[PDB]
Ligand binder design. Structure first.
Ligand SMILES: *[C@](=O)([C]([C][C][C][N][C]([N])[N])[N]C(=O)[C]([N]C(=O)[C][C][C]([C])[C])[C]([C])[C])C1=N[C]=[C]S1
Length: 237
């Protein structure tokens, strides 16, 4: 997260850190708890990943330092990538991680509500992006989960900043005209939480962006409301 600040412990209970154990353990991507055995994240976060056996999901984490060899984690039973996903910039950057065990909810770890199809008219004005990603283009994974409030921008506005790409209605962008605040490397798979009517909704999933926090270069996210049917279908045993 560029231009953000340290999060308060338990402030973003749906946020999880996805680690890979190969060659040695490290933070791979962010993710969101949406069900007792389900993590919603980015599909492009599994590039090179031949098996779910090298994955570990940690919930209720604030500082990466809390993670050690003796720290409990959730195993991943299955990685579910959207069948139309090819690459982040082309859309469909969404994936589900079915955990080997169930998450026992508590104040430090609970699921975030998915947006409703009826809410596609809502004008979320209180949106936050979170993660342990870079605080600058050339950086490293942060110890403390960061947060940054960022305004949504119209898809038409976003397309203007990415005349090289196709910003579809299945994507949603957020950023400042002058930049300064944005998600960055390591935040991928992270949630783009927006508080509407006193309730947090998983509006987007951190996907891609040209550089990080550059002026006239909004962060691009998977537009979650467009995948509620997919999520339900893939979550229904
Ligand atoms: C993800 O953590 C990052 C998320 C960066 C989001 N950036 C932003 N909001 N400004 N994703 C990537 O790095 C992504 N590629 C790009 O963003 C480059 C896009 C330009 C247009 C070429 C992936 C597809 C590689 C991570 N994802 C993988 C490792 S960290």
């Amino acid at each position: 997260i560029v231009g953000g600040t340290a999060s308060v412990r338990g402030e973003w209970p749906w946020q999880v850190t996805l680690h890979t154990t190969s060659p040695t353990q490290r933070h791979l991507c962010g993710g969101s708890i949406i069900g007792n055995q389900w993590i919603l994240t980015a599909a492009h976060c599994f590039y090179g990943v031949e098996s779910p056996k090298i994955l570990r999901v940690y919930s209720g984490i604030l500082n990466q330092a809390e993670i050690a060899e003796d720290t409990s984690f959730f195993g991943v039973q299955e990685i579910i990538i959207h069948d139309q996903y090819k690459m982040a910039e082309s859309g469909y950057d969404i994936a589900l991680l079915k955990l080997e065990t169930t998450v026992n909810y508590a104040d430090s770890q609970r699921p975030i509500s998915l947006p409703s199809k009826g809410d596609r008219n809502v004008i979320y004005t209180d949106c936050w992006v979170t993660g342990w990603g870079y605080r600058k283009l050339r950086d490293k994974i942060q110890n403390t989960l960061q947060k940054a409030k960022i305004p949504l921008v119209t898809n038409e506005e976003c397309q203007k900043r990415y005349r090289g790409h196709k910003i579809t209605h299945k994507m949603i962008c957020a950023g400042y005209r002058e930049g300064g605040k944005d998600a960055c490397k390591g935040d991928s798979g992270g949630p783009l939480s927006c508080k509407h009517n006193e309730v947090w909704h998983l509006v987007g999933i951190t996907s891609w962006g040209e550089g990080c926090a550059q002026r006239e270069r909004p962060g691009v996210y998977t537009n979650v409301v467009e995948y509620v049917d997919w999520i339900l279908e893939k979550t229904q045993a």
